[PDB]
Design an enzyme around this catalytic site. Structure first.
Site, PDB file in Angstrom:
ATOM      1  N   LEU A   1     -61.026 -51.198  40.311  1.00 20.58           N
ATOM      2  CA  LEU A   1     -60.251 -52.423  40.467  1.00 20.58           C
ATOM      3  C   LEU A   1     -59.444 -52.382  41.758  1.00 20.58           C
ATOM      4  CD1 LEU A   1     -58.994 -53.336  36.916  1.00 20.58           C
ATOM      5  CD2 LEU A   1     -61.209 -53.700  37.980  1.00 20.58           C
ATOM      6  N   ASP A   2     -58.544 -53.345  41.942  1.00 15.36           N
ATOM      7  CA  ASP A   2     -57.819 -53.512  43.190  1.00 15.36           C
ATOM      8  C   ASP A   2     -56.316 -53.393  42.970  1.00 15.36           C
ATOM      9  OD1 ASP A   2     -57.059 -53.976  45.743  1.00 15.36           O
ATOM     10  OD2 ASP A   2     -57.879 -56.008  45.894  1.00 15.36           O
ATOM     11  N   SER A   3     -55.627 -53.025  44.053  1.00 14.59           N
ATOM     12  CA  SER A   3     -54.180 -52.870  44.005  1.00 14.59           C
ATOM     13  C   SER A   3     -53.492 -54.156  43.578  1.00 14.59           C
ATOM     14  CB  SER A   3     -53.661 -52.423  45.370  1.00 14.59           C
ATOM     15  OG  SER A   3     -54.189 -53.228  46.405  1.00 14.59           O
ATOM     16  N   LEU A   4     -54.083 -55.307  43.887  1.00 22.36           N
ATOM     17  CA  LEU A   4     -53.465 -56.573  43.516  1.00 22.36           C
ATOM     18  C   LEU A   4     -53.429 -56.717  42.003  1.00 22.36           C
ATOM     19  CD1 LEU A   4     -55.509 -58.777  46.033  1.00 22.36           C
ATOM     20  CD2 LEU A   4     -53.497 -57.387  46.518  1.00 22.36           C
TER      21      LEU A   4
ATOM     22  N   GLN B   1     -53.733 -54.335  39.863  1.00 21.50           N
ATOM     23  CA  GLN B   1     -52.840 -53.305  39.348  1.00 21.50           C
ATOM     24  C   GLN B   1     -51.388 -53.771  39.375  1.00 21.50           C
ATOM     25  OE1 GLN B   1     -50.607 -51.894  41.481  1.00 21.50           O
ATOM     26  NE2 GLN B   1     -49.775 -50.164  40.327  1.00 21.50           N
TER      27      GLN B   1
END
Ligand code: SF4
Ligand code: FES
Lengths: 112, 96, 72, 114, 117, 207
Positions: free
Chosen positions: C32-35, C37
């Protein structure tokens, strides 16, 4: 004698020549910290020396002012304080040093 | 002006000044229209001789600036120009 | 604790298709992506009346350590 | 190469600021669609947010990232301290624009764009 | 084989069988033109290509004259500008006032040279 | 004398030159390309890493008293790396004079502000950031002032065209006032005017 100055934010200063001696002596005592090969010292030294000579040669403000030929006594005091702060700041900066970084060539070339 | 003497007197007592002498409206106190055809002058440049443009080029006397302290190309305390000569009051109404 | 955490996860839009275990690695095991998260951690903070700096919020890519922090 | 930085030194600090800003927008949108009597859904708003973020993902320079951050922060100030209105905010969705046909044949039949 | 010139102090190296005008071009200063076109022969009809030649009194025509080693040329000087003024006064003596109608209205070399020189 | 020409005096071209030498020898750093114009004006180019020193000096030092920042301005020249030219036009009363400070800058190379000294810049800097794209540190409030609150771009540059990219109109279908792309009615005629024949043989540039 007087009642006011003619401006706003000023005062009927009743102790002239004394604040002036104070401020100029302090300017020079700071200049002592400056290398002699700094033009700021080499110039403001004599400027303040002549201002001191003038205040000592003219005791009455109503003539000292028109003699200095600058603004009114209060403006003179304000400007001396400003020069004092300018000195304290040029002491932290190192302007008298050589240049920082020359620019590219075709920068100040107008036309273009 | 077509108004009455008494009303003149009344308005004048009210205001304080006179009005029949400094009215705002315009009763033939102007310059007639239909003015006559005029004839005009010319400049000192409509001669026939000694008018060579090279003398008065105007926009060629210009010359680029005179640089100082470029990057490649005792004394007194000086200023950018002499100081301001302090002003004096007027001969007419210095107070108000 | 963990129960309401996993309920929040099941609630989240595009998450909890099959797994919301306590150990997984968000950007590695879940890919997944930091956003997203950050969205998760904001949901948690609003559930818990809590505050977090982005630094440790991104350090906590692992539900186990996430619940360890909300415990701390 | 040898240049001067702005507000940062690396993509990583740039990205920590970016994440702070994402948090701000995410926690904000509801207030907008509740103050200005909008129509769209909070989810659609957040979709637009993440899209406007993803569409700058070919970036490398921290200076670019930081300028974009500054402009985003300006816009966020503008929004939460309500100056932008329904129009100013819905000017994003191209809501009155036929999606530019990327079908080569569509472009052919319609106009001259290659 | 080369040959030297000192325009306005500025120096230049050229070939023989050359022309004042090709030299001034090598330098950059464009010289007026009415009867010259690099892709043609030469003549001296128009008489607007005149210049001043330091150390020699009389003007010349830079479309025909070949440059002699050591000449200092002067283009924007007094005699030159006066020659051009007179010459254009002459030309425009009779050129009728068909500038508007004249399809060559905004590209007229003569328009431009009158407005400027 | 001639009627149609101003007098090119000597007093000013000498005094301001003396002052230029003065400031140059005082600030051999933070300075380069001082100059005086043929029409009685002084320009001083400086590195952006000396702005506040120069301004404090010129405001405080008695012999200058360049108090009032009559103007702050930008200019764009795209044929160079450092393409923007920031300009300060300053005025002093006692000595009844003006002066011009220049400093080069570039998109992706912000500048140091002066708000601590001349509070007038608090808004000129906002203008600059809105229009051109040049940034300023240590500025409390920096936001679009002139343009819309959603406008995007940098118009006063030389690339952002005249007409702009978007137009507005109302569309009852939604009742709002939406922004669509520019489809003008008449085209912006661009008249070719630059005439070849050189008029100024003094400002020439050789190959
Ligand atoms: S534009 Fe030139 S060529 Fe045409 S009529 Fe006028 S002067 Fe003659
Ligand atoms: S160009 Fe015509 S006489 Fe020389």
């Amino acid at each position: 004698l007087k009642k006011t100055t003619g401006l706003v934010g000023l005062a009927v200063c009743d102790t002239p020549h004394e604040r002036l001696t104070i401020l100029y002596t302090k300017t020079l005592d700071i200049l002592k910290h400056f290398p002699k090969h700094a033009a700021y010292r080499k110039y403001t030294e004599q400027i303040t020396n002549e201002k001191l000579d003038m205040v000592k040669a003219e005791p009455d403000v109503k003539k000292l002012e028109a003699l200095l030929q600058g603004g009114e006594v209060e403006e003179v005091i304000l400007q001396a304080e400003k020069e004092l702060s300018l000195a304290r700041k040029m002491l932290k900066w190192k302007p008298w040093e050589p240049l920082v970084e020359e620019p590219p060539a075709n920068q100040w070339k107008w036309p273009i | 002006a077509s108004a009455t003497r008494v009303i003149q007197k009344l308005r004048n007592w009210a205001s304080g000044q006179d009005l029949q002498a400094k009215l705002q409206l315009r009763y033939q106190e102007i310059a007639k229209r239909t003015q006559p055809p005029p004839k005009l002058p010319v400049g000192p440049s409509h001669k026939l001789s000694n008018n060579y443009y090279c003398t008065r080029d105007g926009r060629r006397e210009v010359v680029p600036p005179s640089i100082i302290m470029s990057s490649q190309k005792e004394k007194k305390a000086v200023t950018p120009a002499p100081p301001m000569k302090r002003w004096e009051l007027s001969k007419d109404q210095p107070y108000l | 604790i963990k129960d309401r955490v996993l309920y929040v996860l099941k609630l989240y839009d595009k998450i909890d298709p099959e797994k919301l275990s306590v150990n997984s690695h968000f950007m590695k095991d879940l890919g997944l992506d930091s956003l997203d998260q950050v969205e998760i951690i904001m949901a948690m903070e609003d559930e818990f009346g809590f505050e977090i700096p982005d630094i440790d919020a991104e350090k906590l890519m692992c539900p186990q350590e996430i619940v360890d922090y909300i415990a701390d | 190469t040898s240049v001067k930085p702005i507000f940062s030194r690396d993509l990583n600090e740039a990205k920590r600021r970016v994440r702070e800003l994402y948090r701000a927008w995410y926690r904000e949108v509801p207030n907008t669609v509740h103050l200005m009597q909008l129509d769209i859904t909070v989810k659609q708003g957040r979709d637009k947010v993440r899209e406007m973020f993803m569409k700058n993902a070919h970036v490398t320079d921290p200076r670019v990232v930081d300028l974009l951050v500054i402009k985003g922060k300006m816009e966020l100030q503008e929004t939460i301290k309500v100056w932008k209105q329904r129009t100013h905010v819905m000017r994003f969705f191209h809501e009155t624009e036929t999606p530019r046909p990327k079908d080569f044949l569509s472009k052919f039949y319609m106009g001259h764009d290659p | 084989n080369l040959i030297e010139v000192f325009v306005d102090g500025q120096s230049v190296m050229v070939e023989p069988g050359t022309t004042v005008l090709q030299a001034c071009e090598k330098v950059g200063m464009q010289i007026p033109r009415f009867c010259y076109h690099e892709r043609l022969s030469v003549a001296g009809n128009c008489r607007m290509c005149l210049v001043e030649i330091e150390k020699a009194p009389k003007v010349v025509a830079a479309c025909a004259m070949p440059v002699m080693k050591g000449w200092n040329i002067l283009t924007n000087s007094e005699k030159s500008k006066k020659a051009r003024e007179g010459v254009m006064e002459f030309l425009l003596a009779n050129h009728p006032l068909d500038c508007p109608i004249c399809d060559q209205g905004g590209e007229c070399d003569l328009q431009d040279q009158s407005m400027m020189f | 004398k001639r009627p149609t020409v101003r007098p090119r005096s000597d007093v000013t071209h000498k005094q301001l030159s003396a002052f230029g030498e003065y400031v140059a020898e005082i600030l051999p750093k933070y300075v380069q390309q001082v100059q005086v114009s043929c029409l009685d004006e002084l320009e001083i180019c400086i590195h952006p890493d000396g702005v506040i020193p120069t301004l404090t000096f010129l405001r405080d030092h008695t012999n200058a008293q360049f108090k009032s920042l009559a103007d702050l301005t930008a200019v764009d020249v795209p044929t160079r790396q450092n393409r923007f030219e920031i300009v300060y036009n300053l005025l002093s009363l006692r000595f009844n004079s003006r002066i011009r400070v220049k400093t080069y800058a570039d998109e992706l190379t912000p500048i140091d502000s002066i708000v601590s000294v001349h509070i007038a810049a608090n808004w000129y800097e906002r203008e600059v950031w809105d229009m051109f794209g040049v940034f300023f540190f240590n500025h409390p409030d920096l936001r679009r002032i002139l343009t819309d609150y959603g406008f995007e771009g940098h118009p006063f540059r030389k690339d952002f065209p005249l007409t702009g990219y978007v137009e507005l109109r109302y569309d009852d279908e939604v009742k709002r006032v939406v922004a669509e792309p520019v489809e003008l009615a008449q085209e912006f005629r661009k008249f070719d005017l630059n005439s070849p024949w050189e008029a100024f043989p003094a400002y020439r540039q050789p190959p």
